[PDB]
């Protein structure tokens, strides 16, 4: 079921690693700066995601941080199947970067802006994700 | 009221956990943070505000709220300033499964939000989708 499908990618800025989870059906994003592109940090990020939204499947790039035990254990535990927006996000980060000392803050401002922007009766990604999930429950 | 959250701190193993509760549903977001400072508090609120439509946050109005940083983040995000025992129980039930407290906290949030005739996670999206 497509309300439950997410795509996870990494992106890199200032020598730091940003994980970006996109809810495929809405375009809603969750992203954060993480210390290193490791299985442990990747598993943590997914555990957090899975507690907030009803995550069924997460499509990943299948690289090094996914070959070990830790992401597999977290996805097993949480019941997750492992079966342009990077550029968009970076564009927004660049507009706000001088407003924050730390990149991590700029990233969360950029998530805010991405999720809440109304491009029109046209909804934001934040509104789209809730409407899609609410529809699937009732 | 769909936009109202409550933010409280709780302490375990010498670490600080911030807990945001969506008052109308009981849905929670929580994380271990390095220190109960304005800067870490503001970061947490900025993250929350990007994920949900946050209009009002009720806080304990303590030391981490007197400075410039939380005020600057809430201004920016358009937030007006105006469960711990449950979470800690769940944390204790899963703690031996994780080396690090932070992981146990996120397993506990998962359990809290998904336990079920709706779960808190279902209740929050229904409330917000009704308001839109």
């Amino acid at each position: 079921s497509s309300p439950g499908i997410w795509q996870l990618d990494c992106t890199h800025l200032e020598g730091k690693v940003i994980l970006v989870a996109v809810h495929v059906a809405s375009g809603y994003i969750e992203a954060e700066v993480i210390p290193a592109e490791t299985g442990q940090e990747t598993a943590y990020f997914l555990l957090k995601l899975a507690g907030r939204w009803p995550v069924k499947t997460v499509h990943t790039d299948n690289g090094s941080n996914f070959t070990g035990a830790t992401v597999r254990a977290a996805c097993d535990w949480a019941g997750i199947k492992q079966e342009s927006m990077n550029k968009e996000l970076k564009k927004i980060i660049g507009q706000v970067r001088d407003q924050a000392e730390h990149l991590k803050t700029a990233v969360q401002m950029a998530v805010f802006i991405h999720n809440h922007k109304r491009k029109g009766g046209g909804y934001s990604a934040g509104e789209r994700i809730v409407d899609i999930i609410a529809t699937d429950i009732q | 009221s769909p936009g109202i959250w409550q933010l409280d701190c709780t302490h375990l193993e010498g670490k600080v956990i911030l807990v945001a509760v969506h008052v109308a549903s009981g849905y929670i977001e929580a994380e271990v943070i390095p220190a109960e400072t304005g800067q870490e508090t503001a970061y947490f609120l900025l993250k929350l505000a990007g994920r949900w439509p946050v209009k009002t946050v009720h806080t304990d109005n303590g030391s981490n709220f007197t400075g410039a940083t939380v005020r600057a983040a809430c201004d920016w995000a358009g937030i007006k300033q105006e469960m711990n025992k449950e979470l800690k129980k769940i944390i204790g039930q899963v703690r031996d499964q994780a080396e690090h407290l932070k992981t146990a906290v996120q397993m506990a949030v998962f359990i809290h939000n998904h336990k079920r005739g709706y779960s808190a996670g279902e209740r929050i999206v229904d409330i917000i989708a009704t308001d839109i």
Partner: peptide, 6 residues
């Protein structure tokens, strides 16, 4: 000076 700080 910036959002997350002075």
């Amino acid at each position: 000076p910036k959002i997350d700080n002075g």
